[PDB]
């Protein structure tokens, strides 16, 4: 499957500093398109991608109301969770949630998602069947019991299989020039002496979209996984990403190393080496 739509919601309590803050950002792949923040002067759902701007007044009003109520729901959920864990009302806590759908090249549902984490630890998750739940502990089991009783999975499923896939398909059509375009990385190898004995060979990948990519080094055709330093893929700010991998090699043996790059915007994977 080639695409996904997903919402990343964060609710944070702050006793003595107001009601818990709620923020929700929506994405299509690695492209953000909406944001909602309860701490904004006038909280409303607002565009963060040009292709969502054409959407009408009713679209904005409806999603604004949806997130205002979700703000209340997650505040009540934070209260409940404090109870489930016998925590004091003095501490600060975080309730995160990710939900959405993945679709194939043809637009058909690959899989749905709906999970939560409390203070950075997995809490409850809708299973891939879109019918049952997996709870991480006895507190999560309380949420599971209430959800099973009210038949919540059935509501999430109707959305994840219907409405979510319909929105994703519409967004993909409206933003086809960017959402459906993969930008390949610009690549090269740099060389930095360390001493008379060793040097670093660093391999670059710049300007790529989407973020998914694989850079690896080999000495004499053998992957150097344990000896390679890799940095986390980082956003450039123009929608694209960057990344590098480095290896310290003995002076004079530079030609025994090759860097390999795989990216979806590349027809065939690349092989490069230091060119003095």
């Amino acid at each position: 499957g080639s695409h996904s739509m997903r919402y990343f919601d964060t609710a944070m309590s702050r006793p003595g500093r107001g009601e818990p803050r709620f923020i929700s950002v929506g994405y299509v792949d690695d492209t953000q398109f909406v944001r909602f923040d309860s701490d904004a002067a006038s909280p409303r759902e607002e565009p963060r991608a040009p292709w969502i701007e054409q959407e009408g007044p009713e679209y904005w009003d409806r999603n604004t109301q949806i997130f205002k109520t979700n703000t209340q729901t997650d505040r009540e959920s934070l209260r409940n969770l404090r109870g489930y864990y016998n925590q004091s009302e003095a501490g600060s806590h975080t309730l995160q949630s990710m939900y959405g759908c993945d679709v194939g090249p043809d637009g058909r549902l690959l899989r749905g998602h709906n999970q939560y984490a409390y203070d950075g630890k997995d809490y409850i998750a809708l299973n891939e069947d879109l019918r049952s739940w997996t709870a991480a502990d006895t507190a999560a089991q309380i949420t599971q019991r209430k959800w099973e009783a009210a038949r919540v999975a059935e509501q999430d499923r109707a959305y994840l299989e219907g409405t979510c896939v319909e929105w994703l398909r519409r967004y993909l059509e409206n933003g086809k020039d960017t959402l459906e375009r993969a930008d390949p990385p610009k690549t090269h190898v740099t060389h930095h002496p360390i001493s008379d004995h060793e040097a670093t060979l660093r391999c670059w990948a710049l300007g790529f979209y989407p973020a998914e990519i694989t850079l690896t080094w080999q000495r004499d055709g053998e992957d150097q996984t344990q000896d390679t330093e890799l940095v986390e893929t980082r956003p450039a700010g123009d929608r694209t990403f960057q990344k590098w991998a480095a290896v310290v090699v003995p002076s004079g043996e530079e030609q025994r190393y090759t860097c390999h790059v795989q990216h979806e915007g590349l027809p065939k994977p690349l092989t490069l080496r230091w060119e003095p």
């Binding site: 979700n70 729901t73 009210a150 509501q155 999430d156 979510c164």
Partner: peptide, 8 residues
């Protein structure tokens, strides 16, 4: 498009 969430 978003969805109505439920209380934990």
């Amino acid at each position: 498009g978003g969805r109505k969430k439920y209380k934990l």
